[PDB]
Structures are given as C-alpha cells and as structure tokens.
Amino acid sequence: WGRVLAILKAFEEDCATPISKLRQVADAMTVEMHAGLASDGGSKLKMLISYVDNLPSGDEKGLFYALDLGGTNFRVMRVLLGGKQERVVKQEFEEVSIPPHLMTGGSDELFNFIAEALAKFVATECEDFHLPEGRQRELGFTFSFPVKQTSLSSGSLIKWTKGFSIEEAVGQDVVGALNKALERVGLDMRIAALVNDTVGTLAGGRYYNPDVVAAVILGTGTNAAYVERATAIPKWHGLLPKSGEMVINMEWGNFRSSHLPLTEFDHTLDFESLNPGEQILEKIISGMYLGEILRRVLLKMAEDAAFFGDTVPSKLRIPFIIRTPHMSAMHNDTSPDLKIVGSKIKDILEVPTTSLKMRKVVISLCNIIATRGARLSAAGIYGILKKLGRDEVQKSVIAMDGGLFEHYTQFSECMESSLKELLGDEASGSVEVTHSNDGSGIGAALLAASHSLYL
Numbered sequence: 470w471g472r473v474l475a476i477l478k479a480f481e482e483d484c485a486t487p488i489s490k491l492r493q494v495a496d497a498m499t500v501e502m503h504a505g506l507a508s509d510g511g512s513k514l515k516m517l518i519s520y521v522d523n524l525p526s527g528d529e530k531g532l533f534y535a536l537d538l539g540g541t542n543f544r545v546m547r548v549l550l551g552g553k554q555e556r557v558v559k560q561e562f563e564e565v566s567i568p569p570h571l572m573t574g575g576s577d578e579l580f581n582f583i584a585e586a587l588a589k590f591v592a593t594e595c596e597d598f599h600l601p602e603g604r605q606r607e608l609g610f611t612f613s614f615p616v617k618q619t620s621l622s623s624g625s626l627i628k629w630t631k632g633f634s635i636e637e638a639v640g641q642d643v644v645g646a647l648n649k650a651l652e653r654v655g656l657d658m659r660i661a662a663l664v665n666d667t668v669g670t671l672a673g674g675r676y677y678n679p680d681v682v683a684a685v686i687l688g689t690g691t692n693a694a695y696v697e698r699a700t701a702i703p704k705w706h707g708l709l710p711k712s713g714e715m716v717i718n719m720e721w722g723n724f725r726s727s728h729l730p731l732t733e734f735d736h737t738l739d740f741e742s743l744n745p746g747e748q749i750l751e752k753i754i755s756g757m758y759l760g761e762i763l764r765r766v767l768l769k770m771a772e773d774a775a776f777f778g779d780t781v782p783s784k785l786r787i788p789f790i791i792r793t794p795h796m797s798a799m800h801n802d803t804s805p806d807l808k809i810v811g812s813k814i815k816d817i818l819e820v821p822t823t824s825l826k827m828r829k830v831v832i833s834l835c836n837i838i839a840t841r842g843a844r845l846s847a848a849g850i851y852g853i854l855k856k857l858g859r860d861e862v863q864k865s866v867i868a869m870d871g872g873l874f875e876h877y878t879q880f881s882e883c884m885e886s887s888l889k890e891l892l893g894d895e896a897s898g899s900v901e902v903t904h905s906n907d908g909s910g911i912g913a914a915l916l917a918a919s920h921s922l923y924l
C-alpha cells in the first residue's frame with residue numbers, strides 16, 4: 470500500500486486550500502471582475518450584462534410558463550402567482566433527461582426537443598392553468614450557457630460548456646432558434662425573458678428575500694450572478710436604468726488563476742476534455758467533474774500502484790463512469806466496514822470486492838476533492854462580496870441552487886463554513902446563504918411575470 474499512500478499524500482498536499490490561498494483566489498476573482506466589467510474581452514470572466522435591471526418584488530400575479538435547459542436535464546413548468554401573501558399558489562412541472570446525442574448534434578434538433586417537450590406539457594393544461602381566452606402564454610427561458618445578451622428577451626450563444634458541442638449554434642440567437650422550433654410544432658408562446666440559470670436563481674431568491682444580492686449555482690456546472698451598480702460597468706451604456714442596477718452573469722466557471730491548486734489529474738482532465746483551456750475553475754468544482762477527478766486518481770493508483778490488483782478494471786477506464794452522486798453516497802458512509810463505499814465501487818467498476826484499506830483511500834479521496842471544490846466556491850463568493858464592498862447591518866444574502874449544494878451535504882456544509890471563515894468573526898453575521906427552490910426555472914417565470922402584458 471506504500472505507493473498508493475504516496476499518491477494519496479501528494480494529492481492531498483497539492484489540493485490544499487489553506488485560508489491564505491482562499492484569500493488570494495478571492496482577490497484574484499475581484500480583480501478579474503473589474504477587468505471583465507471594464508471591457509468585453511479583457512478577462513476570463515465574461516461578466517455578461519443580463520438586461521435585468523429590476524428583480525421580482527413578490528407582488529407579481531398570474532399564470533406563467535418557464536423553460537430550463539441545463540447540462541443534463543430539461544425542465545418545463547408553469548406557476549400560478551397570487552401576490553405577496555399567497556406567492557406561488559400552484560406549480561406543475563416535468564423534467565426530462567437530455568439524450569446525450571442531442572448535446573453534440575445539430576441546432577434544430579436540440580430546439581425541436583425543447584419545443585416538442587413543451588408542446589406536450591401545454592397539452593396537459595386544465596382547471597386552474599387553463600389559458601384565459603383573450604390572452605397568450607408568457608414564458609421565461611432559462612438557458613444555462615454563456616449568452617451575449619442584446620435585450621431582456623434576446624441574445625446569441627457565445628460558446629458551449631459542460632457536455633455540449635453544437636458549433637452550428639455558436640453566435641446564433643437563442644430566442645430566435647426557440648421561436649422557429651415553437652413554430653415547427655405549431656406552438657404559440659410569447660418569450661418574455663431569456664436568462665442564465667444564475668440570473669433565474671437570483672430572481673427567485675430576491676422574490677422571497679429583499680436582501681438577496683447574488684446567486685451561485687453548484688450543480689452540473691458552476692457559475693454566479695450578482696447585482697452590480699450600473700455606473701460600475703464601464704463597458705456598457707445601453708439602457709440607463711432608473712434602478713441604477715444591473716444583474717451580471719459572471720461566468721466564473723471560466724476563471725483561472727495561478728493560485729488555483731491544480732494537480733496532474735486536473736491537467737489531464739482538461740487536456741482531454743471537449744473544451745481544453747476553458748472552464749478551468751468549473752472543472753475542479755462542479756458535479757460533472759468531481760467524480761471524473763476521482764476516477765483519474767483511482768486509475769493512476771490502479772495502473773501504477775496495483776490498487777485493484779495486477780489488472781486495471783476495464784470500467785475504470787470509461788470517462789465519467791464515476792459520478793458525483795456516487796461520491797456523495799460514499800463520502801457520507803460512517804460504517805466501520807465502509808459497506809456503502811464497498812457497494813458503490815463494486816457496482817460501478819465491477820470489481821470482485823474491496824478491502825477496508827481500499828475503501829478508506831476512496832473516501833479520503835472523495836473528501837479531498839469535495840473539500841477543494843467547496844472551499845474554492847467560498848473564495849468565489851467572498852470575491853463577490855469584496856466587489857460589492859461588503860467584506861452596518863447591510864445584510865447580504867446569497868441564493869444557492871444546483872445538485873451539489875442541494876444533495877451533497879459534506880460539500881454544502883464545507884462551503885458555508887469556509888465562507889464564514891473568510892469573513893471572520895466581525896463580518897460573519899452580515900452574510901447569509903440561503904435555500905434553493907427550483908429557482909433556475911421558477912425565477913425565469915417570475916421575471917416574465919414582472920414583464921407581463923396583462924393586468
């Protein structure tokens with residue numbers, strides 16, 4: 470077990486995020502926020518204008534549809550809004566796993582999948598959700614990819630991230646593409662808003678809590694949005710919003726700094742990915758990648774340190790075979806025999822069985838990987854708070870969403886703890902991390918509700 474332990478120790482050390490490194494990252498993040506707001510091409514942080522200069526207040530009422538395209542899942546929903554006291558009276562939704570072939574196929578095919586699913590959902594309208602005869606359906610479109618926004622309800626795709634690669638779609642208007650698809654299925658919908666999922670989550674949180682100033686997604690991918698002062702955005706002067714505010718989609722997944730604790734496994738993951746050199750921060754934080762970092766460490770232990778015996782298990786060679794929900798399960802195991810770790814490894818990798826020593830290393834690996842991702846997330850949030858100048862009783866709330874933060878308890882608890890550590894005793898009480906909802910989707914509908922053409 471000597472060589473295995475040597476790899477583990479080295480990995481542990483290389484992944485280290487002491488409080489000093491987190492401060493360095495937060496500062497680097499804040500610098501890049503200024504640079505990305507200064508000019509369109511001056512930073513790894515795109516800092517995209519959302520054209521959302523006003524967030525939902527809670528008094529919104531009516532019937533609204535929302536559409537949410539993520540990296541792995543697609544969601545359609547409709548809500549009935551009843552104002553300040555009733556809020557969300559009723560909500561109906563469906564979720565569909567995106568067929569992997571659609572992620573790298575053609576543009577029309579993807580939008581057809583979206584429109585066809587929506588048309589089936591609309592067909593189930595009844596009772597409370599029946600469309601009033603003299604009205605049309607109003608829709609908020611959550612699109613979880615970088616978009617060059619041209620208005621509240623228009624913008625073109627900058628690039629794909631996560632598992633997606635449809636080169637045909639790059640530079641095309643996303644709303645226009647959806648509109649064509651809706652027309653292909655004969656569906657009539659007014660698209661009231663196009664928002665990134667971070668922006669949707671921000672609107673969802675603000676709807677319930679006036680103190681919400683930013684939103685963070687920790688799911689398949691990672692990103693953050695926040696409310697910036699319009700005057701503090703030198704690169705942009707389209708609208709002159711009465712609010713003096715403008716929500717920014719940071720696209721922080723693309724953040725890179727020399728301060729990032731990268732390892733050889735991160736480098737090989739990146740070098741062999743769909744988008745080499747891009748989304749560097751996301752590749753060490755988000756759910757798509759955490760399990761893949763684990764697989765690559767285990768693969769090296771298997772190849773060079775006989776971790777699984779004399780032969781490398783074939784399933785260990787399949788990229789993304791180990792997923793973050795597996796990690797969550799294993800990490801959570803406190804049994805003396807580590808029976809959950811043993812069961813999961815055996816199911817995924819198809820190995821005969823695992824000794825306790827093997828299970829200890831795996832869970833140690835899970836903790837190292839999750840802890841690095843969680844602590845860097847906290848540094849990013851701290852970076853946002855610095856930008857807002859909030860590092861009295863000017864309470865700041867961060868709305869959270871995503872499968873990592875929602876289901877991976879060790880991860881979420883570590884992130885919050887690290888953030889409060891960065892804030893320190895004095896400033897700790899001024900910042901709060903909140904909830905989740907299905908905010909990405911619901912938020913887009915609430916934004917549509919703010920811009921409804923009906924009374």
Ligand SMILES: OC[C@H]1O[C@@H](O)[C@H](O)[C@@H](O)[C@@H]1O
Pocket residue numbers: 539612613614615630631665666667686688689690691692693720722751
């Ligand atoms: O879903 C969270 C994030 O995933 C990233 O890969 C995308 O580039 C962002 O647009 C999105 O906000």
